From a paper:
Aurora-A is an essential cell-cycle kinase with critical roles in mitotic entry and spindle dynamics. The localisation of Aurora kinases depends on interactions with specific partners: Aurora-B/C associates with INCENP, whereas Aurora-A associates with CEP192 at the centrosome and TPX2 on spindle microtubules. Like many protein kinases, Aurora-A becomes activated through autophosphorylation on a specific residue in its activation loop (T288). We find that CEP192 wraps around Aurora-A, occupies the binding sites for mitotic spindle-associated partners, and thus competes with them.
An Aurora-A variant with additional mutations in the complementary surface of the C-lobe to disrupt this contact was generated (Aurora-AM7KD, 122–403 D274N C290A C393A N332A Q335A T347A D350A) and its interaction with CEP192468-533 was validated. Robust crystals that diffracted to 2.76 Å were formed with Mb2, an inhibitory monobody that interacts with the TPX2-binding Y-pocket in Aurora-A and does not affect the interaction of Aurora-AM7KD and CEP192468-533. The structure was solved by molecular replacement and the asymmetric unit (ASU) comprised two copies of each of the three proteins. The beta-hairpin of CEP192 predicted by NMR points out away from the surface of the kinase, followed by a region lacking a secondary structure that interacts with the F-pocket of Aurora-A and then wraps around the N-lobe, leading to two helices that interact with the kinase above the glycine-rich loop, a short helix between 502 and 507 (αS) and a long helix between 512 and 529 (αL). In the second complex in the ASU, only residues CEP192506-527 could be modelled into the density (CEP192506-527_F, Fig. EV3A). In Aurora-A (chain A), where CEP192468-533 is wrapped around the N-lobe, the R-spine is broken and the DFG-motif is in a DFG-inter/DFG-up position, characteristic of the inactive state of the kinase. But the second copy of Aurora-A (chain D), with only aa 506–527 of CEP192 bound, was in an active DFG-in conformation and the R-spine was assembled. In CEP192, L484, which is just C-terminal to the β-hairpin, overlays with TPX2 P13. This region of CEP192 or TPX2 packs against the αC-helix of Aurora-A. However, the leucine residue of CEP192 penetrates deeper into the αC/β4 interface, into a larger pocket created by movement of the αC-helix. We concluded that the binding of the αS/αL of CEP192 (aa 506–527) is compatible with the active conformation of Aurora-A whereas the binding of the N-terminally extended CEP192 (aa 468–505) is incompatible with the active conformation and stabilises the inactive conformation.
Author numbering:
A (entry chain E), B (entry chain B): 3 to 93
C (entry chain C): 468 to 531
D (entry chain F): 506 to 527
E (entry chain D): 126 to 277, 290 to 388
F (entry chain A): 124 to 275, 289 to 389
Write the structure that this text describes.
Amino acid sequence: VSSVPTKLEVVAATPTSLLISWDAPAVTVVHYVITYGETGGNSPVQEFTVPGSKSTATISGLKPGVDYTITVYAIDFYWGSYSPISINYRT
Amino acid sequence: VSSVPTKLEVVAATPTSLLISWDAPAVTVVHYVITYGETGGNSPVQEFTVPGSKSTATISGLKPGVDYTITVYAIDFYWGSYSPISINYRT
Amino acid sequence: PQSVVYQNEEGRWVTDLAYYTSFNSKQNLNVSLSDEMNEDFRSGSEAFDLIAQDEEEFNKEHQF
Amino acid sequence: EDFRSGSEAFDLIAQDEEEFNK
Amino acid sequence: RQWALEDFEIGRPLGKGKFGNVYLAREKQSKFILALKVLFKAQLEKAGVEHQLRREVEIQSHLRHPNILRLYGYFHDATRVYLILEYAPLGTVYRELQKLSKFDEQRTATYITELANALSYCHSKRVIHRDIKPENLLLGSAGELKIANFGWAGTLDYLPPEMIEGRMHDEKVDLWSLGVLCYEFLVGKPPFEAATYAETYKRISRVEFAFPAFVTEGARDLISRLLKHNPSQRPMLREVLEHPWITANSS
Amino acid sequence: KKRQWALEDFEIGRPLGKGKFGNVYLAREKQSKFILALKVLFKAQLEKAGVEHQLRREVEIQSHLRHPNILRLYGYFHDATRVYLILEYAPLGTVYRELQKLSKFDEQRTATYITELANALSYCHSKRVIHRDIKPENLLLGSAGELKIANFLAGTLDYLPPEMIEGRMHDEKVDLWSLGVLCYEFLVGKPPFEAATYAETYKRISRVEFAFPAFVTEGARDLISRLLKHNPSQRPMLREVLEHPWITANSSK
Ligand SMILES: Nc1ncnc2c1ncn2[C@@H]1O[C@H](COP(=O)(O)OP(=O)(O)O)[C@@H](O)[C@H]1O
Ligand SMILES: Nc1ncnc2c1ncn2[C@@H]1O[C@H](COP(=O)(O)OP(=O)(O)O)[C@@H](O)[C@H]1O
Ligand SMILES: [Mg+2]
């Protein structure tokens, strides 16, 4: 759906590292959770947290040439998580 | 000043009766308490209520020849009478 | 010596704070106010205007 | 009775909110 | 669960309240008939109601009873908050009373026994409602009573002495409210209603009320039992359900 | 007779404060030259925030409470646009402001404050009144630096015991929870339970999950640990607080 954040782009990347970015949502956000894992490859999903002031996030130590799924969740103080956004990326 | 209603006047008169009027107060009044007494004394003040929706009231049964003090009080639901307003009238 | 009073649910005389209640006693204010502060006291017109000032200030800060 | 779905529904709620302002 | 508007189909308005609109709604799978309350974040934040709403949700969420209106979940977006709520075809008891003016003994006693049942459950879980009133009473498919709005003029008509006075209170506050509700049903106005906060407060603290002539010896007795100043002389909910007047007249 | 209060009865001086709902001003009653605080609340905003009912009720409540550690209400009156409260003047401000200047309080100041409050609360309980807001921003300081409880998400939620956040039955023991949160907020500077989000804050309160910074004495830790118990029956009685070895070891009183 129309969700928070709005546009999620991988804006730079290496064989084993990448940088996702998103559009600052105006709605005040406590922090973003970021999940990443090997797409449908039945290894455990991995999760970390970014302060609500931040708009990018950088992941390193990935596997070369693998298709990965990156989910970003924004959290509101009272109401919990917004509807999330996801992206797929190779390498 | 700082009284509700704001200006108060005797609009009409029968020899033994008078009509008082005021300006619709902006604030929401429950009812008004209208009192009147012989300004001399040794006689008790008379009271009656008028719905908050009105801006006028009759006083009847007055004595031909006596000066009267007429006090209006507007009653708020939570807080009580505003500062009252009053006026004199003869016969 | 001036106060309005009424009897309660149990019939006990208790004092209604909606009416003028004379401060019939020497007050135990253990505090000296500076001359400057004692000088800022305003009554009458000059006093209504102080609160008026602060209301129109307040209202447009909350967009009343 | 008449259950709208999709962007029709989206428009519905959004219009209602716009109105809510007044 | 996770949700967005995309998860269900919206009907058209089912009433418009202080912060937004309930709408009729259906889940796209399952095809459940439900109500979807919507509240605009900006008006919520403006009134400072946000904290209160959040707590009320969490409280209601853990109550499951045919007679307590159920909250299925909630979810939110940039601008609004959304409550998946049970649908209640036949509206509020407040509306039904403003229509018929007053209710017959049979209808009332029914409504009471439902309310009493609901509150027996609440009190089982140590929860007290503290705001049982007609605007909070929604009518089900079979004209069943669904109590809503758990969390905290006519802002004091259904309040007992111990709560106007800031004093310790228990479950016996729902019993007071129940007696008030019985009276209003049969008589059409609340028993302590006055023109002013202070005169109302005067009346409650003295439990000063009277009955219209036509009110029956049965109802008088039960209502009188419920409206006692001392909360410990009010009945238990068991005793209300077993009351002669109630057995006799409840569907 | 039956004279009403009016603005004319007062000399108005310098503003002492500016609040959500209006200003407080230093004032002086004309016949008696008593020095008072006059709180003006704007009716507009009271309606907006829907608290007019809460206010009216608390005014009736404060009228029956007389204690040196409770701020005195002397009267109230209104205008087209304002409710006015005539209050005892507290010339040393709020403990919040004092808790910001200092960061945290030492054991002596803290226990002295706790003692004062425990008396105030024991008084209120003797009148069957419970749940007083004893948060630092609602505590004023009188002319000898004594606490005045005034009764007219930061850490707000932390001060509410579990039974209240879950809507359960609650007794006088809620005041014992608040007192523990306050004791901790005094020694530490922040409340014990605040977290990133409502849900996490609530999770901690309900599960009584918290920690003491290392500088906190075992004595203080014993007192707080007992005030912040989930089961209200297990919480100490006010006399047990007043006679706690940590309190008696450290208080002016
Ligand atoms: N489950 C429901 N079934 C039918 N109507 C409902 C239901 N829930 C709420 N409503 C309607 O929503 C409208 C708003 O009422 P409410 O939810 O109490 O909000 P408010 O207190 O802001 O008016 C009313 O017309 C009420 O009947
Ligand atoms: N009785 C009083 N004596 C002295 N200062 C006071 C008194 N009451 C309030 N103040 C001052 O005025 C400020 C604003 O009043 P406050 O009670 O905080 O308003 P609100 O409840 O609207 O936030 C206080 O923080 C304090 O500095
Ligand atoms: Mg928020």
